[PDB]
Amino acid sequence: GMNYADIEIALAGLADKARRDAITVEDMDGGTFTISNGGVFGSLMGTPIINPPQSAILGMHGIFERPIAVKGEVKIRPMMYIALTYDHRIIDGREAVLFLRKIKAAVENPAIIVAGL
């Protein structure tokens, strides 16, 4: 229940707490998902190891230039690859594939998140 700017406020507050080394112990657990940044450093693909106590980790990657065929003609559109390392004991392959397609549709078009798909 938290907008873009509120998420940036929380993330900038946590980074500012890490700036003067004020990171506590109570904010070190309880995470359910991970958007581990590998994009600022310049990766293209990756397979990030699942860390406890969660069950799926999406490692976003750096934005590069690839001339993708869209609408029947060649156009240079900057994309970036994503990863999803998921446990097979609970997340099925269908579940993770639809999950990744839904995140792809939500990031390519951010009207889906208020549309409810």
Added chain:
Amino acid sequence: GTRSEQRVKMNRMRLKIAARLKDAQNTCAMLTTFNEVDMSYAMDFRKQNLDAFTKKYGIKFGFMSIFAKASAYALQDQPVVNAVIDGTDIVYRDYVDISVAVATPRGLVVPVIRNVEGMNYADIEIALAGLADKARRDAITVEDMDGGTFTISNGGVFGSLMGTPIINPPQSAILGMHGIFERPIAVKGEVKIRPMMYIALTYDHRIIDGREAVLFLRKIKAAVENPAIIVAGL
């Protein structure tokens, strides 16, 4: 070319709505402003998600929930537009209930969508289709006839271009959306044919200032032209 007249007598309810709008005009201050909203992104979004919403939620959607959710956002981030005057008191409200006009066999009944701010497109369409289905077999009750804070009175399906809809109690601002036409608008330095539609905003000057209504209408225009603003938080 005949000098023939008759003495037809109307019903009580016609005098009821007539005296209601007369007291509404004699109480509120009539004051309007207009703007133009691009709808081409809404055309593309509906054309790409028609089958998606049909296969996911089962009902048909069109042209109203985009304006409704944008208005709900603009009332949440500007809470004096929903506030009214009851004597010598101003009632700021956090909850917003959009008062929607729809046709009924007796006339024009006005059902109200409840708790619209934390409510998606498809849920708003579910509530509106439920209210229209209740109006289909004439099951509209009395408890859903009041409490509205805003109005997206439909004048678009009927074919208007501009309008100045009268402020009805107990709310304080009514946006009358209009029909989508074709106008070749200059965008990015060249002439392009983009289908727009004009909007209206008849707002009381006793509580909503002109700056407030102008920024309100610009924010709704930005929210309907680009529906990423509503999750962006502007």
Added chain:
Amino acid sequence: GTRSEQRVKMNRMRLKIAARLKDAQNTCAMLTTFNEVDMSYAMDFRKQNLDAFTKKYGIKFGFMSIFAKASAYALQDQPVVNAVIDGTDIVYRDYVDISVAVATPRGLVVPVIRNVEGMNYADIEIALAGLADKARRDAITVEDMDGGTFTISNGGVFGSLMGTPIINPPQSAILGMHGIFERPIAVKGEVKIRPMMYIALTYDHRIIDGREAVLFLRKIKAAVENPAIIVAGL
């Protein structure tokens, strides 16, 4: 930069029209809507039938009878637009009398065209030219000052673009036509410069509903853009 003021006293008739429009605004509900009407077919029709009407009927015609006959048709096929309220009664009327404004040396006198529904273009121009000729040597009587059901108040020769004309008694809807300008409108998928002119419709909400006025204005727009509709029966 002088602090000089004077004490000029007006006449009784200025207070008469002032109190008349004040009681008209305090009785009727002020409520407007607008639309745009293509006039290029009217330009071609007048340019091809100027000498025809001149050699057949002897008088000069322009820009008003097209709007008058279309309004007469739209009042014949929608008879609640002409109806008014006198206390607690609604007077549906089959006869329609267009109340036309024209200039006079004293001010603005308003002659009324009688029995306009069964009356062609050239006959309407004959009646209007006769009323203007009666106003030329100041022969306007009292019996042609009331009974009007509609008004095509001319604001087009003077150069307006939009307007919201005040409802005057004893009618209930007034269409103020405006001046013809140049706007490059997108028609049939490409940009074309077609001269249009905006129209107005200030209608009481106590008797004319918004749906009624919107369909009324669309029907007049279709009747003036294409004058075959008036014999077609739509």
Added chain:
Amino acid sequence: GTRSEQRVKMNRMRLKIAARLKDAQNTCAMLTTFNEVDMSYAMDFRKQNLDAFTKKYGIKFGFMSIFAKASAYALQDQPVVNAVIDGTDIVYRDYVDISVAVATPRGLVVPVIRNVEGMNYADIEIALAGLADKARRDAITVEDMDGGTFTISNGGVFGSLMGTPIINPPQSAILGMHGIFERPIAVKGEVKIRPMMYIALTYDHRIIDGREAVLFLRKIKAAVENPAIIVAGL
């Protein structure tokens, strides 16, 4: 989705402006007309004389004195627009004082520019910048709160397109200028993208006739599109 309301009490001045505009609407007759004004010559003139006015007079100018001096000219050559009714008297005035709205920390205070008819662009900007500087450290007095005959209420910096500003006492006509947008207008037989901005004119029908306001708005449109008319004498 909470049923939470509060009982916030406003100040005396909000009721003061509310009752003032209520008595203004109940006294004057609400009646508007609009037009469109080309601003490309104003764009070129400001872009060529920015450094000239900066190096000659020392202050920064924009978008308001052109409309102010044109309105002063149109009130000097049409002296019934400035005249009002105080009971049963019409007060023709030769002096004109434009009543200008500007923002203040408490709300919206309205300083008045005095003796604007014999007063150039740079002198009007000197007076307006002095009044805004007086409003900066909150030095607005009571003697400059009345006596205004016209109003160029700014709705252009905030982003409106049309508006119908309420007539405030003790004047009788208020022109609300609006924001400059981009519209590809047909001029000289071809389509050209020229930035215009719409204007408003809400005028009492008790003293200003519709012909008077239409010619008044056309004269201001010609004076702002071409500022050689104001020395030409039309």
